[PDB]
Design a protein around this ligand. Structure first.
Ligand SMILES: CCCCCCCC/C=C\CCCCCCCC(=O)SCCNC(=O)CCNC(=O)[C@H](O)C(C)(C)COP(=O)(O)OP(=O)(O)OC[C@H]1O[C@@H](n2cnc3c(N)ncnc32)[C@H](O)[C@@H]1OP(=O)(O)O
Ligand SMILES: CCCCCCCC/C=C\CCCCCCCC(=O)SCCNC(=O)CCNC(=O)[C@H](O)C(C)(C)COP(=O)(O)OP(=O)(O)OC[C@H]1O[C@@H](n2cnc3c(N)ncnc32)[C@H](O)[C@@H]1OP(=O)(O)O
Lengths: 380, 380
């Protein structure tokens, strides 16, 4: 069934083929300019070696786990230590990306690694607290603790493309190395295709006069789809590069038991259905750590969805607005608009059809969607 | 998996949304102009009532079958009658479409119905000859002949969307009438989408100065993909309207046992593989009536593929060049170019990959393909 997905790059080689064949070798006129990392030689940036400076805090979580598992201090004190460790995870890399500053894309990938490491840390803390509360009911404890293997399990969880820590993981085989290279080659060519389609389509169409949109929109609703359809293909190729290619490569090199991350997000009859569908690991993180602890007792789901999307709004604002240090709160409000939207398109999809719900999903994803974040990300 | 197919009409509503919302009601400024049939009222054209004048020749085939099955004359004489009946099937509707002439699109659908009725007739003759040769080995014969039910079986085969006659057919249920209407509604909106995408994309891009292509092509290879990508979407929507919608509707109203016509043509690693794949009934007709009678004895496949594509070239030329009565032989030579092409891309696909074979298939289908027939069909 893969040829109709395959046709979407045939028509991108085919339309403006001429501006594809004017390059010398591997986009010789557009190299290290789009999806760019300047000075590929040496490749030593003081935030790139500070991308491994956030790895001393998983070691700090292992030291406070060693304090509570060798009975150095009580459980509440360690919980406070986890709270301060994951708030230093907020406060320290924003100080890294403001003071002794660097490029915007390096700041964006540092904030994305900060967000992913924060989820991985909070999931490690919640799973360690759950297995400590399970193990303290009886006097079984844990003989043969194997702190090298626990260190390797925590570090292997930190490089893993999932956000749910277990000490025992499903594994696979790493004998297919030509496949790994083929996926990497597919990723690099798409990256070059990403830079080509950003420089040829979005960059001449954003670089003009623009105005902030209002409640009334007369003769201005044609721009929010015409400047969003190449952004729709940019987000589709971003999804294919991250969730189908890079996460599958990082699953394969670490020998992961499930390449399960992307799951059926194109047949979304509504958003809300879409946000529970579009990636497995962060949706498993919300249904394991925030929504379902709210749904254990005394909070219903009709504020749990708002507080889960509030912390997702906080993560998107920390990912986008902080490396540009402008504090727009446009991705915050643009995804806070989605939270009444999930409820709306559910009232619209009731007494209706799934097909026209998918039509209005792709319209919602066109205008008030995730390519809007890339549009505001290429508007600074 | 249907949402990624569904996105291709979201991006067509989205790009030039403005020229979609300037119409009054059901394309009020472009109605009965593209995919047009003038004078919808009365709807009585002298070739439209001559579209049922080709139905007296299935009755003629039943009369000559009644002559041979009631032993009025020997088998060879009836075979000659079948030969003249299906050559009057060639010679009479071209006289209908030249003398007392009509519109070009009515001539194109009359020639398409002529081609389909010719295949259905030759398949009926070959299957009747095969069951007559099977029944004449012993003295079983056929008690309870049921000539009303044989008449209904032949007529039901003539309205059926398959080209292989059997007296016993698999059936289904016709209780889902809201589904039938939904598919018909999907077909009509796509037809309107077809007329919209033909008038907005192909018609301003063909109506200019054009030149015949040669062996050397310098600074002219960008036109044969840029004027072919909207033609690629026109042929994709033509395939979806005919083989997925209209043939499934005609399967459902006649209660057919298999909606099997389209089969996996998008993952074509080569042409030749593609021509055996793109539709079930005409490919079953070639492998049941022309190729495999050649492969019974004394002819190898290395002229059988050329003679099968020669008669397919004759059918495409009779479909396209005869209603425009210009005798270009450009669709003839453009599909005679494909016959060395199937062999070529098979030598190219050997010692190679299936993925880059699919890449070069979609390049071949872009330039020297079936949208070229629609490009020359909208160039007169
Ligand atoms: C050192 C570095 C190493 C790096 C390594 C590589 C990287 C790591 C790799 C990968 C990690 C991620 C990389 C990218 C991260 C980027 C940063 C961000 O964080 S961007 C965040 C954007 N925002 C969101 O994603 C919001 C997500 N929101 C949601 O998932 C949902 O909307 C949610 C949970 C808030 C609401 O879910 P509703 O639609 O499900 O809820 P309802 O109405 O209540 O229905 C619940 C029912 O759904 C069914 N259901 C269907 N599927 C289900 C499932 N999978 N699990 C549970 N229930 C499911 C069940 O019936 C369930 O109810 P019953 O549990 O039975 O009571
Ligand atoms: C009153 C009106 C009512 C109307 C009702 C509605 C309408 C009716 C509805 C629908 C009818 C159609 C409507 C449209 C008609 C438009 C007009 C036209 O005619 S346009 C014609 C365009 N031209 C073609 O379509 C050329 C088609 N060409 C071919 O099919 C092939 O290219 C062919 C047969 C000429 C060559 O086939 P290679 O690729 O198969 O041959 P290899 O190299 O030899 O391989 C053969 C092997 O392939 C495998 N194979 C795979 N699939 C197979 C299969 N399905 N059958 C048999 N073998 C198959 C088997 O291994 C086989 O060998 P082993 O038979 O085992 O010895």
């Amino acid at each position: 069934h893969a040829g109709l997905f395959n046709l979407c790059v045939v028509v991108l080689i085919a339309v403006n083929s001429r501006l594809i064949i004017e390059n010398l070798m591997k986009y010789g006129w557009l190299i290290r300019t789009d999806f760019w990392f300047s000075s590929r030689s040496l490749r030593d940036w003081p935030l790139f070696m500070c991308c491994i400076s956030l790895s001393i805090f998983p070691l700090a979580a292992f030291t406070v786990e060693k304090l509570v598992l060798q009975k150095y201090i009580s459980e509440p004190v360690v919980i406070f230590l986890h709270i301060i460790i994951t708030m230093t995870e907020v406060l320290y890399p924003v100080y890294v990306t403001l003071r002794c500053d660097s490029a915007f894309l390096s700041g964006v990938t540092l904030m994305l690694l900060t967000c992913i490491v924060w989820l991985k840390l909070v999931s490690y803390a919640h799973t360690s607290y759950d297995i400590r509360s399970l193990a303290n009911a009886a006097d079984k404890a844990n003989p043969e603790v194997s702190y090298y293997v626990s260190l390797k399990s925590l570090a292997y969880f930190m490089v893993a493309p999932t956000l749910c820590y277990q000490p025992s993981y499903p594994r696979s085989a790493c004998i297919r190395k030509g496949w790994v290279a083929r996926q990497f080659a597919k990723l690099v060519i798409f990256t070059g295709f990403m830079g080509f389609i950003i420089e040829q389509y979005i960059n001449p169409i954003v670089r003009n006069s623009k105005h902030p949109l209002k409640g009334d929109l007369l003769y201005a609703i044609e721009r929010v789809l015409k400047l969003s359809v190449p952004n729709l293909y940019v987000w589709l190729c971003m999804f294919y590069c991250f969730f189908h290619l890079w996460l599958n490569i990082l699953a394969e090199l670490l020998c992961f038991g499930d390449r399960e991350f992307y799951k059926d997000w194109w047949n979304a009859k509504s958003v809300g259905d879409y946000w529970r569908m579009w990636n497995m690991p962060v949706h498993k993180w919300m249904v394991r750590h925030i929504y379902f602890p709210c749904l254990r007792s005394k909070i219903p789901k009709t504020l749990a969805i708002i507080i889960a999307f509030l912390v997702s709004a906080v993560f998107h604002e920390l990912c986008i607005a902080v490396p540009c240090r402008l504090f727009k709160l446009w991705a915050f409000l643009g995804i806070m608009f989605q939270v009444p939207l999930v409820f709306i398109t559910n009232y619209l999809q009731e007494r209706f059809g799934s097909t026209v719900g998918n039509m209005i999903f792709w319209f919602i994803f066109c205008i008030f969607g995730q390519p809007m974040c890339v549009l505001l990300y290429y508007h600074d």
